[PDB]
């Protein structure tokens, strides 16, 4: 419910912006969130990442702790470069020798004052000679349209390109108008594709104390830890660390809402998740309230599996204001710096 | 009274330690700010603690606390001249920002010295090389001889010692608590000093009774401080000498593991044997430091004091530590550090 | 030959006192060598390695001065674990973008004061768990795999030296035993049908270029660090592989290990002639330096040369000694159960 | 001059990387020299040492490779602390059972951007706790007064000064160059020293001529050294005839100044100790002609008659720091260049 204490980490953010590199995380001191990070690369991009770790919170903590040092090595923000760093991160994790176990979600957000066409399916961008996230979950198949933003009115004030890198079950939704849409697909034992990929490589699933586990240990078919299920004695990776990259464009006024599996558990239908996200308000001055709400009523339906939420309202223009607040009742981080108003929240 | 809410800032401290430099001021959000602890690039075994009691506004004070570490990094070494060189620099720039002048300052340099060198000493205070008078003598106390100390032949210095440098400029106080003995670390720059009183008046200054209180120029409740430029060697009255000095009083002292540094704004007092007695009798300890600080604020309010209250307390450990911890909470405004050879704590209440 | 030399002496005495050292030797060219490195916690192990740079030595220098941190992270010194680290070094090489790439040869020598039993074919050990011997791979005859018990075998009385060879490229490693010599590694280039079929099968295409068969008409190796332009970095498959060819052999005291860059073994070119020459070169525990240097001068057979020779001692030790000198640049190690030497062409 | 030299560059980068190092030069033959070293926890403070051994290199060689061990034990760099370590060393050396024989000269050089003040006798810094005499007057020079020097209000070196500590024990010499000026930093421990000859002779020891010149007890070439235990407090010598208590002096130098040192052989043939100062005064106030500077001293001492062995050292106190690192051990004869940050030193030996 209502909050009672807060501090102003503000000064910390001011010095960061000025140096061109920063990474603000928020762990509750199993999941760890990096509310917002900045790459030495592009001053126009902001990374937001989530790490839900199984069996420990050690691998997730490691992940969120070194990620910006790896992403800082991308030479361009695209699928293969993203995927390169991922396998590189997994590799070093195995060298960190920690009790394996962690999913991952990295959201890349870039603002383009003057965007130029690209090939699009609905709101998603097709990069190369493809199936939509929408076609994945139900959703009717559909036609790619050559989209020219140059002459698009809604792109009058620029647009926000979004790269979503997901390995696991953390979810990401784009909210726009009175509609909501998934930006990534869960890598669970639910999906028939993943389930089939695993079993077709010689992987066996088994119900263990109430839920499906790969080899009776991994609660995912795709994740960062569990090297006991990656090659090395297996011939193939049963649990993949290959981040499947997704790209979406967004207009000013839309919002990015993301969270760990916990934040989205207990919804009769995956359709009901979008309907519930498309229902909530979440205005610029209520981003945080929104982030916190998500946790609050996520505990009303009952699951205290870990819970982490994140909200970001996309701005019409830049604000030279700056503000970063941390508060408590679960932990809440608010960041209001130059073209983003964001916040995450996590209960115990 | 009792604490209700508190947040754990451990991540922020873990990161700072890794960077080799940090600041962290406790601010009540009225007139004072506290740099509970900060690191200097280079100085690995040194910590810093500062206190700023704002006069007619929190402006100058907040300015000082915001830049204090920016000047301390330009120290080639922690000296009396080197620190006084920085004071001038700060006071100089404070005027550049021309805010409503007004701020007392109490800065504490503490370094861990495993195997310190010999030094001429007047019971705990260290006499500089190359004309000495001690905080003790000054506060009109029995005057002792300077005696050469050999830490090689001293069992109390077996597990190292902490060297303390204090730069006082104002009425803030710093005491050293060693078992059931307690000692002052500086002289409050007030009209109660016959040394300060002489200086101001000789330079032409005029103290005068205003609203029951005696103020320099009937404005400044101190003979030393940052800002208050109408009495500095500033310009309009083309004063030929600082009536109010920005020249800090720097003193050195050594402590043993187990000792506690006790510090607070002039408001934390309204007793000086009393001050000493009280501190010498308080139950400071590793897992009590925070309480120790809170109690000090409580004790004074209880002692019916209306001025600003800010208290700081650090318990000097025997062995260096490995864990880390930082909490910020409310009942008043508290923040505590638990890193390495450091166990810090501070408090403030409007 | 021999005009001036130092005593990095103390330098090697304390690094030895910490269980971790990594002294390299480079020209003052393109290749660089870690004449000897020690990994933390493996007192009876020693690493030697050399890196041949292709198109600018920036990439090889990286590797030689980073290789140890990586090795210090391997759980056990075996095929899987070693390849494990190659995959990683390759990756961190990318993020530190340098042109070209490098060939690599790493040698791990471990002293077994008390051998046991291992399945071998000649001096080569077959890993516990389809073996193709190096000798057979080079043109030598197929030989039965046979169980060997070092337990009471006299040759192994004073103990044995187990050797792991990680090879990526065309650098060569050989074991000299008396007037005989065998190969511990084998290059994997385009001249290899098998290696060639790997590339083509993955969609890579070789094409002759100015008298030279090049992968994609750019790189000359099929395995090396770098050349990411042909790495999986649409390249959905690695064309140039960083995955090393690892092999194990065992040596008895008295025999020597001899390694060198492609330049060192350039114009003999009869897998057999290279071996004969080495078999024929005399090497006492007092001439390793002469050796290493000789190998470089003998290269004055119309040619970038770098050599490494090491004489495995019968005894447990003698003491500290590390000399560096010039005519060509040389580095010389002498501690515990080790007598090392390295040399390079200016 | 130089025919074959060689870059030890990388070693000094790694060494500077970590906090300490010590680079002795030796060979070509009883003396050893620590061209440069860095006590841990002590930036902008470098060391330079020289060990000239009598009939045997073992006593010198133990010192040159064990001194930085003791030096890192100094709780501060001053007389009391420097003298105490000499004690331990001479003590531990006795247990090494080496063929006694070696003089010593140690130079500590610290730079302070902002010097404060000291009581000074024309360049020499008088220590706190005053009957001060020392170098200049002791070498029979014009008496100069003790002044209260305030570096804070001194024009020269508004960019700092270099504090020099010399721990001399034996017949080696160390001089400070400044412009066209030459100045001694130590007094040799020989029979020529009225004080030394006096101390020894009042202690019971006797000088007597053996094969040419006179030696303490008929064996020692100097009155102070590290070995020669037969003359250290079995006769109940309750007084050290051959002391191992060094003569510690302190001086400051302005940037642009140079420090020059050498074994007794380097300065071997001069009609006077003034002749030496004169000569060294001729030498290039080396901006970076340092290496040749040292070299010349070798050749020249070889130009005058060479008797014992010869070793030289030169350091130039730069106006500014530097990021360029370079170390070159080379052989025209044996020599090594040292260039790093505020440092620029040169080593040299032959025999």
Automatic annotation (TrEMBL), chain B:
<protein>
    <recommendedName>
        <fullName>protein-serine/threonine phosphatase</fullName>
        <ecNumber>3.1.3.16</ecNumber>
    </recommendedName>
</protein>
<feature type="domain" description="PPM-type phosphatase">
    <location>
        <begin position="14"/>
        <end position="316"/>
    </location>
</feature>
<keyword id="KW-0904">Protein phosphatase</keyword>
<dbReference type="GO" id="GO:0046872">
    <property type="term" value="F:metal ion binding"/>
</dbReference>
<keyword id="KW-0464">Manganese</keyword>
<dbReference type="GO" id="GO:0004722">
    <property type="term" value="F:protein serine/threonine phosphatase activity"/>
</dbReference>
<keyword id="KW-0479">Metal-binding</keyword>
<keyword id="KW-0732">Signal</keyword>
<comment type="similarity">
    <text>Belongs to the PP2C family.</text>
</comment>
<keyword id="KW-0378">Hydrolase</keyword>
<keyword id="KW-0460">Magnesium</keyword>
